[PDB]
Nucleic acid binder design. Sequence first.
DNA 1: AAGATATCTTA
DNA 2: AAGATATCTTA
Lengths: 238, 241
Amino acid sequence: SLRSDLINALYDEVCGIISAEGKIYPLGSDTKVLSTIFELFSRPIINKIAEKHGYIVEEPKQQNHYPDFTLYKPSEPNKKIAIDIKTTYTNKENEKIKFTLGGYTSFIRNNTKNIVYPFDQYIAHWIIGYVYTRVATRKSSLKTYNINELNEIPKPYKGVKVFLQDKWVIAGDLAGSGNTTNIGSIHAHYKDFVEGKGIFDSEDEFLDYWRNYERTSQLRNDKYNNISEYRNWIYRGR
Amino acid sequence: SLRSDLINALYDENQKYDVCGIISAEGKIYPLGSDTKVLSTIFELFSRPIINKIAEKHGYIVEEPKQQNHYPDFTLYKPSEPNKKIAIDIKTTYTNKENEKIKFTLGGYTSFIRNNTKNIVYPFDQYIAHWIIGYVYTRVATSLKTYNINELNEIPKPYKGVKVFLQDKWVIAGDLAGSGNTTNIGSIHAHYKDFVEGKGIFDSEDEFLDYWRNYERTSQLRNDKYNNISEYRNWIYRGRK
DNA sequence: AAGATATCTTA
DNA sequence: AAGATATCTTA
């Protein structure tokens, strides 16, 4: 399928930035550097596979718009797939990780706000999750290298494990961010996201929970703070 | 001096080299995207080597943060003068037309400029200078195809007119917010050359710091207090009340 | 001014 | 949970 192909290609597949003159500057250790590194790394892979499956690939023509990639075949343009690259680290393998999966106050409550095409034209919402182990930056990460010095440039990451999965499967009930209100993924191990061991029962339960989520913890206290407390709410009448 | 050196280096180095992509240890080159986040990381990893060239030339030690969200991007100093560090921070912005006014988000106003050791590499009071290295670039029209080692020139870039400057945070800060939920200090909204000429609004770094330490998070709690420089100055005049 | 995009630390 | 890091957008 398009999916079996994509995840199969991502799996089978960086030391720094290069300039037109020839200089290559090393990478920094902050997450803002890696996110960009992974997003870019993913761009020509998602486009090669999409082609293969007669899909068109689009990107936000406008900034601050979800998702990183919009996919669709010409014919059936009302059936669009949404792909989003996410990124998180890990200090030591096996540890539990979590992802921030998007705002619950935008394209999930308003159909046009902060998204390319109306929320309703997307049939799927995948999450290509990248994970990496943190590694302290190097002094040598501060000098420029040359095309032939390449195999010597250190990187701020060790072992990167990547997974692909439907958003709601890996979504949780705990908020991913406080002030910028983000949906939070499950806080589990890597293969739990890979085996899709989530907590929500259906796509619609996922949206029902988050679409009904209150910002102010006070209002949330007597509404429902988690999955458990949610279903009760359900059995009471909402 | 260290400063004029840094500036002159950021000019000449940035005026001749263009970053057109990321590279793999094996050879493959991946093009860039046209969105600010992508761009703002480039100019960040780009300056690091220069700030390190010149700092070394003046015998200054350089240090990047230890945690993933600590200010500033670099801490300079002489071991001969510890409690005297220089803080450098790179900011980015964009313009559609070449001759527009710009504006940067100069960090938070409720973190370290309000609390000594919150979100900063070393206590705030251990810094003498706080510079900003601004990068203004120009958005262009927008590829998704991997270019080989011998194809650097075909690689299109999504920016067309980088302009950098180094100036003091306080000199260029304004009386308005740069962000709401992320409580950021706003810079002056002015034409590029003004950031270079230091045509700000605050009379001293002393006035800058106090404005931002009393700025109430919301217009409502503000109106009775103060919403700009003139109102701040009347408030001060009226007896900080 | 006020909230969105992404992701993290502090506890 | 909340508030930090950066920057944008909308009104």
